[PDB]
Amino acid sequence: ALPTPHEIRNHLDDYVIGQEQAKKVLAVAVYNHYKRLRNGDTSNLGKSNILLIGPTGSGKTLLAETLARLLDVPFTMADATTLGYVGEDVENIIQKLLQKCDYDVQKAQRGIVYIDEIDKISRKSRDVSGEGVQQALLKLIEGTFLQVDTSKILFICGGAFAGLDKVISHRVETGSASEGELLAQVEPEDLIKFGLIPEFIGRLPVVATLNELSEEALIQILKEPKNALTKQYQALFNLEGVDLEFRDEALDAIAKKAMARKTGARGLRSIVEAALLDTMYDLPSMEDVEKVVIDESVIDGQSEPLLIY
Amino acid sequence: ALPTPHEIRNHLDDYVIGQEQAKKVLAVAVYNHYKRLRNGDTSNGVELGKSNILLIGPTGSGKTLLAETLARLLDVPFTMADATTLAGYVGEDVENIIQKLLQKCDYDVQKAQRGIVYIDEIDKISRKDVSGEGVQQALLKLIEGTFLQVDTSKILFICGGAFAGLDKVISHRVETGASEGELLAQVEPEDLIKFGLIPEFIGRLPVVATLNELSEEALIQILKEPKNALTKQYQALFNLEGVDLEFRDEALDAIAKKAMARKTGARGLRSIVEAALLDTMYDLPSMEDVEKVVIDESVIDGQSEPLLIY
Amino acid sequence: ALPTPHEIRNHLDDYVIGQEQAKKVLAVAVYNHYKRLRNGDTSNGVELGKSNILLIGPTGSGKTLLAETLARLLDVPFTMADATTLTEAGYVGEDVENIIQKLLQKCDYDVQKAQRGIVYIDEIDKISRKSDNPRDVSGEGVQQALLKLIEGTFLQVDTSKILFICGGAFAGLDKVISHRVETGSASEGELLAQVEPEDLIKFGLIPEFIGRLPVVATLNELSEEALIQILKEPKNALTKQYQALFNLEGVDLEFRDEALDAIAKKAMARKTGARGLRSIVEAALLDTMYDLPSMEDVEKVVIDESVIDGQSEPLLIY
Amino acid sequence: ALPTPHEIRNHLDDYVIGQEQAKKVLAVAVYNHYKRLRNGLGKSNILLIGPTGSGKTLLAETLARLLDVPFTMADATTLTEAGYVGEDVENIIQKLLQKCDYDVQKAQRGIVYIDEIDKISRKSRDVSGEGVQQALLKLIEGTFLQVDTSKILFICGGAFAGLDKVISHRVETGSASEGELLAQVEPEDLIKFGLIPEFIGRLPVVATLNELSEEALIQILKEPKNALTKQYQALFNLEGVDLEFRDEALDAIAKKAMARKTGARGLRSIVEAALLDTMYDLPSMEDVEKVVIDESVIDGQSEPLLIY
Amino acid sequence: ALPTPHEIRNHLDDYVIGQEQAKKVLAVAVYNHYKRLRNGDLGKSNILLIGPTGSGKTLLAETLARLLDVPFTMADATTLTEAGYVGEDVENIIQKLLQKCDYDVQKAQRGIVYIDEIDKISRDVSGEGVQQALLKLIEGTFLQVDTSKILFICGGAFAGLDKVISHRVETASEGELLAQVEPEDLIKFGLIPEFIGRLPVVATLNELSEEALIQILKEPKNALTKQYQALFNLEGVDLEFRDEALDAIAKKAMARKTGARGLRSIVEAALLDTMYDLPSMEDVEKVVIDESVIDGQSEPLLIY
Amino acid sequence: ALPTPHEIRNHLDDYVIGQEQAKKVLAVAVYNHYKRLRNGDTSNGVELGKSNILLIGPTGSGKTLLAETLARLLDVPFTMADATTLTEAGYVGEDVENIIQKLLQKCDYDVQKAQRGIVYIDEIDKISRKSDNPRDVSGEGVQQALLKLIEGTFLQVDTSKILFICGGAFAGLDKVISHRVETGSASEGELLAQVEPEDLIKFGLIPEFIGRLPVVATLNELSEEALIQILKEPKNALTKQYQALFNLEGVDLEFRDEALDAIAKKAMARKTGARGLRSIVEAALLDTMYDLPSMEDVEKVVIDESVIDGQSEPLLI
């Protein structure tokens, strides 16, 4: 029984924060895709391939993985950068999909494939080789000794598209907003000028966009997600018989640190670990009730966490 | 009384926009073909070209429309066929195209010989494999001409194809030390050879027409007529939802215009329709209405939402 | 009853103009090849040449036409192939045998008649792995893979019996020969006559491949006066074909000599040889044929200002 | 029963000298990693940054031994410049299984050390080097062994010669030692060094090693439970002879090692050559003890003192 | 049943003329090589052919294989030089050997490999790379085939070799000088010591005499005259080559410096016209005189 | 009763000329290895060096002869193997254990005596994956597969007990060492003495493999005298090889000492060392082997006059 777009988006809210508009798009795209497969297209339809456009560490990869998990469907990643002999490496993505699929052809067709850094292969001011991948990987999108047809499998292509923000503004301008508002005005002709071939873009009808993560968002990322850092470490300290408490001032402190390093959410973990290193070290050697992390423990990194006996 | 190429092309200007060079070629090719048939080729023993045609142009340029139109202009039985659907048992499916031509011909052997046959996606069968080529040679037997008892020698063959890679092989030859339109004009039989077509097949397609831009009318037809047309596909999607999906003519035309402005051809049609029906499909399973009507304002402007009838 | 080399050449004169030396070579080569087959080579143990041929001539010189004509004159299954479509594959090794299934198909899958068949490989000069015109490892692979055919090995057919004709332009060949034949301090035709297996070696062909092509035929560059003859003399000459087309229109088509020469000059500047003749004539009569049936005149006269110019329209006589 | 970080560090003190801060870090990272696995969260992957012959490799090996866990090494250099090395990246896995008796579960508990990570960094072949950072990146997360590399601990070692500079260009203020500078290391410093953001984000735990002191080299010859002198004293011991290393001789060995820039790795090769002649004509003699002096090491001219 | 060296040399006399010393060496080298393989082993017995271009180096290698019904494959040392990617092209020689071997691992090991123009790779950094890369083959390492069993024959002209030998042997003719060849002479030439040690057996070919070419047209079982006499024979006509004509053919070959390879191209052009109007006549025999070859003016004699 | 390193080297002097420094290292390494085995390493928990050896010397320097001799002097099962026949396979991982079954074969299938055995791996330098002498992925696979043996794991025999001696020429090693030992702006023998584990690293050997070969012996380029022993003593000595060839012909081949010395001198004059020995013997026996399978005699004797002068033919009985 397929989950409605409402249900898919709801389960995406549990793993990904914000990006509500993109999750609406993905929900529909995904739903329609499998809705199409489960009725054998049409007796005697929509490719529904998706194009993720957002900054690095926005959640592009996370969304793809989550979609597959929520639909108990084989999932495999691949990099456009790593892509004549690579034409026989493009089919490699398929064997990997079969590996995680128990070599079940049918389940392999229901699978999802995420290609990262698509904006990197775009030949714009090696070009001849790069375009070669756009056209070689293009043969996959349509669908062709596994014997599996790639027509059935859903393709999700993610990319940062740094220069895309510019080409859009050069078009949308008038006479004389923010990146989020600009990426909404994105059109397939903007991707053309960016470096993507018309035949490739025509194979990616569904276009999703991810907004710039807020500083406050990072704080949410540390708390709200089911696998949020704080929850992960509270679980660790929990099997030690100790309660771990993160003061709001400390969480904000962590976000600020992450912004100063321009590492976004990816740099969150490396900050928390270093802040809890000493504590976890001499933790199994003590006997206290709970440990409370304050701002002074994070930003300054001088004072140790409060210990409650 | 046969229509002059001047008259033929002139009638092609009414169904097809632009493509003036291709229509001139088709006009002469067609005219010569029937001019040869209506004089019994040549008494005794004299040579005469087959006059078969090879349409080379992007998807939604007017290839198919041109073929259909030609037949209507000459009140001649017309039948289509896809090169992709064409195996050894398909060799007996190649003759199927003939029985279909006879069906629309009222089973009149003579009028069937005057008939026109359009084969789409020829560029697809090019082995560049053992089976695909098998069709090139199996269908090759038709071009020459052999229990209908009808000879396919008389019937005109028009092969349409996009030839995506053809634009490259030509540039690798014509180079020295322009646009696709200028490059496709330099097309030579040897370019199709390297592309995947066998020499014996190309030699059977002497007349080569080339289309450049797209045809607004065909783009509209592509959204409707095809068995797997976008509208029909989405009407099927909305149908298993208990809802009827209606595309107003203004909306379809609106969709074509968008596609032309983006120069993405027919390939860019879907991406336009999807974006227009995104919101609707999202909160569709959560509603309870009879049908949804897509107007022009929903496509071009994309501002208003589709009309909902309960 | 096999045709003597005399008869073979004579019939080649009806389809090809000039290249007399080449036609004499092909005549002997072809005759000997089948003369060998129709006597079962040699009983017990004896030697016999493979008799495979290597056509060397400019593009549109008649290489292909010669190969085709040879087959028609001997009512023998004929099939073409491009050496370019072969290079760069080990999966093409199973595509090299494809040429055989083609030969069978046109031969009514007849095993013996397929063995009598003729195979023409075009653009052999393109696969040669050499520093000239810089994949090599893959190209040579074909010289050796297709080499397995030349000798002869689920059709069950042996390619030992079938005649192989390999055509090519060999653009750089004219140079390597001159770097050898030179003395201390003529034309391409005279130079291509001095051709030697070692010249092809330096060009890019492997020794084992050349040794399988003993018979070497050389084609001259079609003369402008020859091209003029091609447009007129042949029974299926272009002018005659187009005069026939204009004829069922009730109109007489006249090609002025100044126009025919103009056509030849156009063909030479394009180096397309005779193969480029049609494409020039068509474009010159294009406009005319378009609005021809719409008119009611007596005859149309093609002048030199209509061909090379492509400007002034053909003279119309009412 | 898992050993506390205290216990892990204690056993590390026995095989490795100094680097107390690094051993504290590794102890935690390791403890947490397995603490996480044994309860069915943080990846806890580690990045060792220290000079050549500082103890990076030794730390990795020791950690595994102390935890009776399958261990395997690999060189990041042998990886770069290939798409066929992507299938060589999984090779590291098959080898981990070989030493694991092909037990999928114990293979997941295993530890993997990648040396010379600083070498693959494409920074001021590049396109190929980065390819490994991302190819080996797929391992870090975890994916016909059927084993998932999500469970296995990854330890990436490197010298990072240029890292000392990029850190100084950031930490500077307006107008200390490498040890103090490597402490100020941040993921953004590695970014500028040539590492991709997605790779560094997979190596959260960062351990920094100091340059082994020349006097530390002397300690390396004495203090460790498996110190060279203790090894050779044992060898000489089952001969009925007592081996005595004079302090002047131990310092002499250290100096030799420094002039050769071979660090601690070059210690053995020096001691062996110094005791080579003695061990040869040892079992043929009958004395009480042999005393190695400086004259026997540096000059190598004089033989070791023999007491009967 | 292995053929004795006597027998091997004998069958070599039928395809190659002169070079009797080289054929005795190759005969022993080959015999021992397979005598070793058929008893499960010892010497590598790899061979180094040293002779001018068109002396018969290649022909000797090919003939040896045919006489022993063993897979044979050629290769050019020049196409190898200047690459580390050619290190994976050195294995190509093996896959080719397997191709002609029907992919039979065992028969591929019995195979023979001839590398031409070895003297060309002699150094520079890239060229030496092949000497050491192709060196790994000589010893013998997804075919799974070991190149230890396969016999290697390395041919070369060694233009400068005649000089280095003279600078040493000094205190006759090239033939006498190439006999005094020593591994140290190849060292100074450009070959690495480790490569030469892998080529123990050294065969030296003489420069084919003018008169030798004459023999080349007659003596060999597949001599041109015999081939064309057979061609004219299935026409009912007897073909006779005058001695003055054969000598005339040899001279032509020398003036063109094409050696024996240029023999055919000379005979063909001389008998071209005759073969053209041969099947159209009815005579007893055709005689080829010198006037028909050298001058190419007069037509061959026709006896009815 | 184990022989002292003194006694071991002394008996090595009877089968090998020169290479005294190498023989001293081998004597100590070997002695220690078995000294450790015969005392069951160490009761409870104590450390002990594996004591595996790495022979580095030119071809025909006696690397193989030293290995074989060591086994004979200690009445211990010995087996050879070529690292070259191993590379390029995962199925060779099951061929790596083959070396063990061969060791058992010569050991009468006695597990214990098999553990005391010695294994010599030749041409180790060949498997090294490096830019020098350009498969790599496959070669390394053996370094790590054979690596599993060094440590020690249907035999049930543990390869931990058996001594491993890996020989190789290491042609490029002489260069990498010079690029390191250099100072600002001697001979190979002096250069190979400066050898370090890091030099083998850059050469193509993995760190984990080298750490398993603690003992490193270096051989010099042999003198003209040693050549005579190389022609006779080694298991696969040329004379034995050709005596075997002549043997399957029903004929006995005898090399007079005067001839053997004659061969050495020839090789010495050409300065090709031991590598040039074969090319000399072949040329001297060429004619004989040619018309040999065609005759019917008892034995052929090679004298000095047949080698040096090359004028007179070998004696036929």
Swiss-Prot record, chain B:
Disruption phenotype: Delayed and decreased induction of the extracytoplasmic-stress response. GO terms for molecular function: ATP binding; ATP hydrolysis activity; ATP-dependent peptidase activity; ATP-dependent protein folding chaperone; disordered domain specific binding; identical protein binding; protease binding; protein dimerization activity. Binds 1 Zn(2+) ion per subunit. The keyword Metal-binding applies. The keyword Zinc applies. Keywords: ATP-binding, Chaperone, Host-virus interaction, Metal-binding, Nucleotide-binding, Stress response, Zinc. One of its GO terms (cellular component) is HslUV protease complex. Component of the ClpX-ClpP complex. Forms a hexameric ring that, in the presence of ATP, binds to fourteen ClpP subunits assembled into a disk-like structure with a central cavity, resembling the structure of eukaryotic proteasomes. Interacts with Mu phage DDE-recombinase A; this interaction remodels the viral transpososome for replication. This is ATP-dependent Clp protease ATP-binding subunit ClpX. It comes from Escherichia coli (strain K12). The gene is clpX. The chain holds residues 63 to 413 of 424 of the full protein.
Swiss-Prot record, chain D:
It comes from the Bacteria. Its cofactor is Zn(2+). Binds 1 Zn(2+) ion per subunit. Keywords: ATP-binding, Chaperone, Host-virus interaction, Metal-binding, Nucleotide-binding, Stress response, Zinc. Induction: By heat shock. Part of the clpP-clpX operon, clpX can be expressed individually from its own promoter. Disruption phenotype: Delayed and decreased induction of the extracytoplasmic-stress response. The keyword Nucleotide-binding applies. GO terms for cellular component: cytosol; endopeptidase Clp complex; HslUV protease complex. ATP binds at residues 51-58. GO terms for biological process: cell division; protein denaturation; protein unfolding; proteolysis involved in protein catabolic process. One of its GO terms (molecular function) is unfolded protein binding. Component of the ClpX-ClpP complex. Forms a hexameric ring that, in the presence of ATP, binds to fourteen ClpP subunits assembled into a disk-like structure with a central cavity, resembling the structure of eukaryotic proteasomes. Interacts with Mu phage DDE-recombinase A; this interaction remodels the viral transpososome for replication. Belongs to the ClpX chaperone family. ATP-dependent specificity component of the Clp protease. Uses cycles of ATP binding and hydrolysis to unfold proteins and translocate them to the ClpP protease. It directs the protease to specific substrates both with and without the help of adapter proteins such as SspB. Participates in the final steps of RseA-sigma-E degradation, liberating sigma-E to induce the extracytoplasmic-stress response. It may bind to the lambda O substrate protein and present it to the ClpP protease in a form that can be recognized and readily hydrolyzed by ClpP. This is ATP-dependent Clp protease ATP-binding subunit ClpX. It comes from Escherichia coli (strain K12). The chain holds residues 63 to 413 of 424 of the full protein.
